[PDB]
């Protein structure tokens, strides 16, 4: 009685475009074109697909199948699979928090640009502003200029001294105080996700119609726009020129694996939640297949969208697009790409749809990000919770604002990197490995093939079987070992992070991980019996 059976989605296309909305984000736009053109160019497509087929797709489809089959949250599903690994559901809840502290501040920057892009003369065109230094040298100014080590462009000056105000902080040590503009921007973001999540899957699923389709439109406008620019073939040459020798490096495969994993994002509980609210009779194999193939191809065309404008920018400057595309991160889109689109007709248009496109890219993904955690807590503490959804949703949203207050600082950008590199990647890889191993090895991949066989009507192929049993946990294990062995020294804006950052990072990387061995200790520590007896009753799910 009472609630009993769970709710169901409003249409097939909503959940298709919804999982597409989670899959597609900023990184699809600029991360993949950079990592592609840097690691052997077009040849990077060869391992990228392999790491997709053997790694990303199986985790994606396994996660999705479990989600639609068991209809449980990220915490409650472990109660009915492997209770000792229930802490996994908790770990994600912490991980997501760390992500929601920086991912939306980027959307706040794109939002600050968007509202600052309504003026007839764009701010980052002239140097006669209140934030530019004496180094600021700009165009529509005398030709022959010969750039100096200390000179700075109006776009770099605008991004550095205004929207970030990063010159007012010395690094991780001193980063305060808070830029209230980015606080209001990210507040508006938390509002626009508040009215798109608070109701549940119906609103996220309806806002997704806009948040997942518009990026293709803006990418299409900047695509046909960037294609008509003179000398844009340079960026395409640098973008797709095959350099097969780079394929001999054992690093490149690692980069491809990490890319496809962190662009499909399986085992994060978001796909579990998005899959939970669907029909048991409804097919999901085709769903997972098509959805991934969209995320990959969308990245492929996004490469052109970026490197066409970068090619035109390298033509107006002096070629070897790599030099104009050295820095990967927020500067490739907020400085180089913005300064590139500044010299184009009706620049207000392309600017508005560009930064609006950035916000539109982050919105759907963060919808899904929150959706997974919300589903997990509501399903884990029912009746004690579900009293209202706006209460718990409001709680997690304002929590994400207070979490971003460290990021809204002057040196917030610094923290963004520390959180983007150190915290998420190793832990997420770990929980994906433990999750995959627990579904494929503990629960038994045989019974999983029986669950899919009861789901779609047919048992999954021997390919999916061997991928889940061996190829996928080895796929995650690869990136785990390669990551731990060579953690990266990182620098941003002529500032090398202190030696101790990794320590801090490891804290932020493990402070979220402590819950699963301590929960195994809590489960095995709480029920008396013998060690062999209690772990045998704790590995087998509920019989009824």
């Amino acid at each position: 009685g009472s609630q009993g059976e769970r709710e169901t989605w409003g249409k097939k296309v909503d959940f298709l475009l919804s999982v597409i909305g989670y899959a597609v984000d900023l990184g699809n736009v600029w991360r993949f074109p950079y990592i592609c053109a840097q690691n052997g160019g077009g040849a990077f497509l060869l391992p990228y697909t392999i790491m997709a087929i053997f790694g990303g797709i199986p985790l994606f489809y396994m996660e999705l199948a479990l989600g639609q089959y068991h209809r449980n949250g990220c915490i409650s599903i472990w109660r009915k699979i492997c209770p000792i690994f229930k802490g996994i559901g908790y770990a994600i809840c912490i991980i997501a928090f760390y992500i929601a502290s920086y991912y939306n501040t980027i959307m706040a920057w794109a939002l600050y640009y968007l509202i600052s892009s309504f003026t007839d003369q764009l701010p980052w065109t002239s140097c006669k502003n209140s934030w530019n230094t004496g180094n600021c040298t700009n165009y529509f100014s005398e030709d022959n200029i010969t750039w100096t080590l200390h000179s700075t462009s109006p776009a770099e000056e605008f991004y550095t001294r205004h929207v970030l105000q990063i010159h007012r902080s010395k690094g991780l040590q001193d980063l305060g105080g808070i830029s209230w503009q980015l606080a209001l921007c990210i507040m508006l973001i938390f509002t626009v996700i508040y009215f798109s999540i608070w109701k549940g899957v119906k609103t996220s699923g309806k806002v997704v119609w806009v948040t997942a389709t518009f990026p293709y439109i803006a990418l299409s406008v900047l695509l046909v726009r960037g294609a008509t620019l003179p000398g844009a073939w340079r960026g395409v040459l640098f973008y797709l020129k095959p350099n097969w020798q780079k394929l001999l490096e054992t690093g490149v495969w690692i980069d491809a694996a990490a890319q496809i994993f962190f662009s499909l994002g399986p085992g994060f509980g978001v796909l579990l939640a998005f899959a939970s609210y669907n029909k048991f009779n409804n097919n999901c194999y085709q769903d997972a297949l098509v959805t991934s193939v969209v995320n990959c191809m969308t990245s492929f065309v996004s490469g052109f969208v970026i490197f066409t404008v970068l090619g035109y920018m390298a033509e107006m400057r002096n070629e070897d697009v790599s030099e104009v595309a050295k820095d990967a991160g927020p500067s490739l889109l907020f400085i180089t790409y913005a300064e590139a689109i500044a010299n184009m007709p009706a620049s207000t248009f392309f600017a508005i749809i560009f930064f609006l496109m950035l916000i539109t890219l982050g919105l759907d993904s963060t919808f899904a990000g929150l959706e997974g955690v919300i589903t997990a807590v509501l399903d884990e503490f029912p009746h004690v919770w579900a009293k209202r959804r706006e209460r718990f949703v409001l709680a997690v949203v304002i929590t994400c604002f207070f979490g971003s207050l460290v990021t809204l600082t002057f040196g917030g950008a610094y923290v963004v990197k520390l959180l983007e590199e150190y915290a998420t990647g190793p832990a997420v890889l770990t929980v994906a490995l433990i999750e995959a191993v627990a579904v494929s090895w503990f629960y038994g991949i045989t019974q999983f093939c029986r669950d899919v066989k009861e789901m779609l009507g047919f048992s999954p192929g021997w390919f999916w079987r061997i991928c889940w049993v061996a190829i996928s946990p080895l796929f995650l294990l690869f990136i785990i070992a390669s990551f731990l062995m060579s953690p990266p020294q990182l620098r941003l804006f002529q500032y090398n992070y202190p030696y101790w950052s990794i320590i801090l990072g490891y804290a932020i990387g493990t402070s979220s991980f402590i819950c699963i061995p301590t929960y195994i200790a809590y489960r095995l520590i709480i029920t008396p019996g013998t060690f062999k007896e209690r772990i045998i009753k704790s590995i087998t799910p509920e019989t009824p």
Partner: antibody, heavy 119, light 108 residues
Framework: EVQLQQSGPELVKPGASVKISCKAS????????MNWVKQSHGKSLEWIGN????????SYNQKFKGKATLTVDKSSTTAYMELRSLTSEDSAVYYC????????????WGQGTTLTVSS | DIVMTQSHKFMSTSVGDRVSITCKAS??????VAWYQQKPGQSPKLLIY???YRYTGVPDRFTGSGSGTDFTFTISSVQAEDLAVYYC?????????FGGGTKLEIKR
């Protein structure tokens, strides 16, 4: 005006090391990349690498990686290039030349440094 | 990398004649070629940058042209002191490479 006074000629036995200086003057030293070009007897110019005087930002050539080591000192506005594993091919004239960051031309050069690697 | 090829190692000209040295690059360069003048016994002296622009302190008798891959250095009034070895160098892709060097010998 702008002057790049290099060091004198050096006669060094093969297998040893040798360091060449480059006193820069006449401009804001921190405003320009400091480059090193190799010129073999009867050969063309050969770009060794550059260095950012602010933080010692060395950007070498794959052909000279581990062959040359560029350093810089702001307290005296002087850039140095050290060479190890000296052979008969290194017996060439070396120049230190100033360059902006873009466009990357070599506006001012040094007088050259005659290096002879022989026992 | 980039291979700058000066097919003609030597070129003969006279005082007052119109001389032009060619320069072939590996790939498309747009307008990123600099011409240097190394007089016998002196350091290479920068004359042209970015294909056509002249550098400061260079007489009007030195000009540059070309757009794409092949570029040309022109001297209208050759003087007795214009006797030198001319190099061409690209400035777009890392690393920066040079030409083989064209010695300009004067005929009298």
């Amino acid at each position: 005006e702008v002057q790049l006074q290099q060091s004198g000629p050096e006669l060094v036995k093969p297998g040893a090391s040798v360091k060449i200086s480059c006193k820069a003057s006449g401009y804001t030293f921190t405003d320009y990349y400091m480059n090193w070009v190799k010129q073999s007897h009867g050969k063309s110019l050969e770009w060794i690498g550059n260095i950012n005087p602010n933080n010692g930002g060395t950007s070498y050539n794959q052909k000279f990686k581990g062959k040359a080591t560029l350093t810089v000192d702001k307290s005296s506005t002087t850039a140095y290039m050290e060479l190890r594993s000296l052979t008969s091919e290194d017996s060439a004239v070396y120049y230190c030349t100033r360059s902006p960051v873009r466009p990357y031309y070599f506006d001012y050069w040094g007088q050259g440094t005659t290096l002879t690697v022989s026992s | 990398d980039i291979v700058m090829t000066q097919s003609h190692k030597f070129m003969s000209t006279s005082v007052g004649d119109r001389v032009s040295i060619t320069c072939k690059a590996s790939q498309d360069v747009s307008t990123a070629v600099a011409w240097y003048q190394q007089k016998p016994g002196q350091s290479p002296k920068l004359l042209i940058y970015s294909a056509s622009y002249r550098y400061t302190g260079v007489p009007d008798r030195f000009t540059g042209s070309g757009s794409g891959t092949d570029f040309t250095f022109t001297i209208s009034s050759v003087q007795a002191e214009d006797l030198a070895v001319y190099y061409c160098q690209q400035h777009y892709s890392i690393p920066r490479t040079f030409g083989g060097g064209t010695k300009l010998e004067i005929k009298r």
